[PDB]
Amino acid sequence: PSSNLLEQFILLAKGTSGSALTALISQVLEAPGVYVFGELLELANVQELAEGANAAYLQLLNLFAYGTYPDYIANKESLPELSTAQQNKLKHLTIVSLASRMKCIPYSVLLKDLEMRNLRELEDLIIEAVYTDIIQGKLDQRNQLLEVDFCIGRDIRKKDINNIVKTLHEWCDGCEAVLLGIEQQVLRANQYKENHNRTQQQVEAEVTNIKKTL
Amino acid sequence: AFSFKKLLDQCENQELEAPGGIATPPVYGQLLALYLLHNDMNNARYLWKRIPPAIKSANSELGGIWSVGQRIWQRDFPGIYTTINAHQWSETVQPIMEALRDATRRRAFALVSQAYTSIIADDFAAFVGLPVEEAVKGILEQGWQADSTTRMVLPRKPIPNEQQLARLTDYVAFLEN
Amino acid sequence: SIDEIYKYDKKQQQEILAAKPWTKDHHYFKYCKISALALLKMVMHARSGGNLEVMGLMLGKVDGETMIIMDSFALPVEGTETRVNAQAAAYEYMAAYIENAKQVGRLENAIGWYHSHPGYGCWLSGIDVSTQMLNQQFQEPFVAVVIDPTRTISAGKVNLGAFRTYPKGYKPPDEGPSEYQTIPLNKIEDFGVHCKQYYALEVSYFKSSLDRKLLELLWNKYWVNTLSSSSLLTNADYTTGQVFDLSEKLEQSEAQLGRGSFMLGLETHDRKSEDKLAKATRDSCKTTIEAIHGLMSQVIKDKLFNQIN
Ligand SMILES: [Zn+2]
């Protein structure tokens, strides 16, 4: 029901705004379920908050959209104080960013990037994220590793569109190169078959010539 | 190394194409030194036996290189380095002699690292032809372990897609006919 | 011409049925060519069955030493595997089915019977042998086909055999390679017995437009993940069995050659030894091409996916 709640707040943001909107955004950061904040950021009233006097909540929402937990630790003075639900949601988002790059995460990295002291609560946060269908993976405790098979994606600041285009172009070029290599293999196999047929017909011609000789 | 191999091949060709059947003393000196560089002891020994004694008597430097080669055959590194740095080598022999000196260092460095889990500092110093103390900092900067109490050194032992596709196509072509 | 085999020549079939060359040789029929359609239908019916034996009739024709199966159809009978000539209960049905098939342009007549052995290999039991003997007493040119749908699925390779019986009293000649099958304890005892009893027909088949439609459609989507790993040969049961049979064949060839060195002037032994060595070599070769193609597909796809960019 997070998407339905997200859409209702989107409809409400089209009208009422201001301190109510900032409190509403704080409720979004506290209400579990919402893992995508890109749709909220594109509302015109969020842009109204940009030129508005209040900016702590906007910088808070901006960090949830693009920043991670370590950036939030750096901005503990310019951001409104979070709740236990807001902190866990941001920690889950940070884990998503970490799992996006590397599919295997050692426990040392988990204890470092997330201000995690007790490993017990680290396991509790990891299982909580998985059971809310955020990340799919497996935990290796003997090697102290977190193997993540699948994870949800994240938002884009419209500056990564160029990177997406470059990646798609690279994929297309690689596919075309593999196709050309396959076609070259077609040609080489056909040439080898033609050479075998030429050898066979040469043998047959030699046999027929000897038969005519005798 | 690559230039030394090219120089060796050129010197080898000149010996085969010798007009009077004998090569110039610089060619023989270069050939003998280059064989020692590559640790080709058999070729160095056979070439020394091939050289007439007249050149050996008229060129005492040739005997000095052979004496070093005998030391290399016996693999007495403290003796090898002493003999290398004892005789003055001409401008055609000094650079290649230093390359042999460097080659001996790398060889003995690898021999100790592979074979010797532990080695006395004096023994390692003798093997590398350097005194003990700066040899220790040379290997500590190499990420090795040294025990000061027992003076023991603990060395730390250290296809493209197109080629694969060509090989697999060769597999199929060979097995198809 | 790919479609030449689909042409039906009635007079030519009548001429072959009047000639009866199979009466001159009990090993006359050596090859069995099966259309895509027939095989597919049979497999589907057997798998719908699941663990119970089903059976049906095969429509087709003969061409030299080759028996050709063009189509098949299920028979509504009980007692497949327990009743001798169970097919007989469907006589009336068979007559009507064929009559109605002729009305829509199915010209080929009965060429054999097929039945399934779910999870116990492909062979002829005492009952199957009695049935096919009767089927070769009135309708001499009859081929018995046996399919294991369960092993097809588990092995990832079609498990089908085509068989013909020997007449009562007649003994088979020296040759009989007999590929070993993993039939259950007592079922395998009876299997050795009946592999000594009958003779298999070299599966030949024919690539056609029916095959072209199937291969194209299924590979496009059922193999969107053309991956399906890449090595269903990983199971060390088929390739390993072929390797062991190869080893046994070459060991027997060496045993024959060693004894043949004392006899001076035995050409037939040399001929047989050379032929056996050649057959073993070709079998090993084809296994090698299969493995190489598997690795090639694996390498191309996994390289592309893992490290495209
Ligand atoms: Zn049966």
Curated annotation (Swiss-Prot), chain A:
Protein name: COP9 signalosome complex subunit 7b
Family to which this protein belongs: Belongs to the CSN7/EIF3M family. CSN7 subfamily.
Residue window of the full protein shown: 7 to 220 of 264
GO terms classed as biological process: COP9 signalosome assembly; protein deneddylation; regulation of protein neddylation
Keywords noted in UniProt: Acetylation, Coiled coil, Cytoplasm, Host-virus interaction, Nucleus, Phosphoprotein, Signalosome
Function: Component of the COP9 signalosome complex (CSN), a complex involved in various cellular and developmental processes. The CSN complex is an essential regulator of the ubiquitin (Ubl) conjugation pathway by mediating the deneddylation of the cullin subunits of SCF-type E3 ligase complexes, leading to decrease the Ubl ligase activity of SCF-type complexes such as SCF, CSA or DDB2. The complex is also involved in phosphorylation of p53/TP53, JUN, I-kappa-B-alpha/NFKBIA, ITPK1 and IRF8/ICSBP, possibly via its association with CK2 and PKD kinases.
Superkingdom field: Eukaryota
Sequence ranges assigned to domain PCI in this UniProt record: 1-153
Recorded coiled-coil stretches: 182-214
Assembly and interaction partners: Component of the CSN complex, composed of COPS1/GPS1, COPS2, COPS3, COPS4, COPS5, COPS6, COPS7 (COPS7A or COPS7B), COPS8 and COPS9 isoform 1. In the complex, it probably interacts directly with COPS1, COPS2, COPS4, COPS5, COPS6 and COPS8. Interacts with EIF3S6. (Microbial infection) Interacts with vaccinia virus protein C9L.
GO cellular component: COP9 signalosome; cytoplasm; cytosol; nucleoplasm; nucleus
Location in the cell: Cytoplasm; Nucleus
UniProtKB/Swiss-Prot annotation, chain B:
Cysteine disulfide partners in this protein: none
GO BP annotations, alphabetical order: activation of NF-kappaB-inducing kinase activity; COP9 signalosome assembly; negative regulation of cell population proliferation; protein deneddylation; protein neddylation; protein phosphorylation; regulation of protein neddylation
Pfam families: CSN8_PSD8_EIF3K (PF10075)
GO cellular component: COP9 signalosome; cytoplasm; cytosol; extracellular exosome; nucleoplasm; nucleus; perinuclear region of cytoplasm
Keyword terms: Cytoplasm, Nucleus, Phosphoprotein, Signalosome
Main location: cytoplasm
InterPro entries reported in the protein's UniProt record: COP9_CSN8, CSN8_PSD8_EIF3K, PCI_dom
PROSITE patterns given in the database record: PCI (PS50250)
Residue intervals of the PCI domain: 1-158
Entry-linked Gene3D superfamilies: 1.25.40.990
Superkingdom field: Eukaryota
Location in or out of the cell: Cytoplasm; Nucleus
Record function comment: Component of the COP9 signalosome complex (CSN), a complex involved in various cellular and developmental processes. The CSN complex is an essential regulator of the ubiquitin (Ubl) conjugation pathway by mediating the deneddylation of the cullin subunits of SCF-type E3 ligase complexes, leading to decrease the Ubl ligase activity of SCF-type complexes such as SCF, CSA or DDB2. The complex is also involved in phosphorylation of p53/TP53, c-jun/JUN, IkappaBalpha/NFKBIA, ITPK1 and IRF8/ICSBP, possibly via its association with CK2 and PKD kinases.
Subunit structure: Component of the CSN complex, composed of COPS1/GPS1, COPS2, COPS3, COPS4, COPS5, COPS6, COPS7 (COPS7A or COPS7B), COPS8 and COPS9 isoform 1. In the complex, it probably interacts directly with COPS3, COPS4 and COPS7 (COPS7A or COPS7B).
Family that this chain belongs to: Belongs to the CSN8 family.
Name of the molecule in the record: COP9 signalosome complex subunit 8
Organism: Homo sapiens (Human)
Taxonomic lineage: Eukaryota, Metazoa, Chordata, Craniata, Vertebrata
Primary gene name: COPS8
Curated annotation (Swiss-Prot), chain C:
Location of the protein in the cell: Cytoplasm, Cytosol; Nucleus; Cytoplasm, Perinuclear region; Cytoplasmic vesicle, Secretory vesicle, Synaptic vesicle
Outcome after substituting H115Q: Abolishes ability to deneddylate cullins, without affecting the 'Lys-63'-specific deubiquitination associated with the COP9 signalosome complex
Keywords: Acetylation, Cytoplasm, Cytoplasmic vesicle, Hydrolase, Metal-binding, Metalloprotease, Nucleus, Protease, Signalosome, Synapse, Zinc
Annotated S-S bridges: none
One GO biological process term: protein neddylation
Transmembrane segments: none
Residues given in the record as Zn(2+) binding sites: H115, H117, D128
Highest taxon of the lineage: Eukaryota
Motif placement: JAMM motif: 115-128
A GO molecular function held by the record: translation initiation factor activity
Coiled coil: none
Names of the cofactor(s): a divalent metal cation
GO CC entries: chromatin; COP9 signalosome; cytoplasm; cytosol; eukaryotic translation initiation factor 3 complex; nucleoplasm; nucleus; perinuclear region of cytoplasm
Record flagged with keyword Ribosomal protein: no
Pfam families xrefs: CSN5_C (PF18323), JAB (PF01398)
Subunit details: Component of the CSN complex, composed of COPS1/GPS1, COPS2, COPS3, COPS4, COPS5, COPS6, COPS7 (COPS7A or COPS7B), COPS8 and COPS9 isoform 1. In the complex, it probably interacts directly with COPS1, COPS2, COPS4, COPS6 and COPS7 (COPS7A or COPS7B) and COPS9 isoform 1. Interacts with COPS9 isoform 2. The CSN complex interacts with the BRISC complex. Also exists as monomeric form. Interacts with TP53, MIF, JUN, UCHL1, NCOA1, HIF1A, CDKN1B, BCL3, GFER, PGR, LHCGR, SMAD4, SMAD7, ID1, ID3, ITGB2 and TOP2A. Part of a complex consisting of RANBP9, Ran, DYRK1B and COPS5. Interacts with IFIT3.
Family membership noted in the UniProt record: Belongs to the peptidase M67A family. CSN5 subfamily.
Miscellaneous comment: The CSN complex is associated with some 'Lys-63'-specific deubiquitination. Such activity is however not mediated by the core CSN complex but by the BRCC3/BRCC36 component of the BRISC complex.
Name by which UniProt lists this protein: COP9 signalosome complex subunit 5
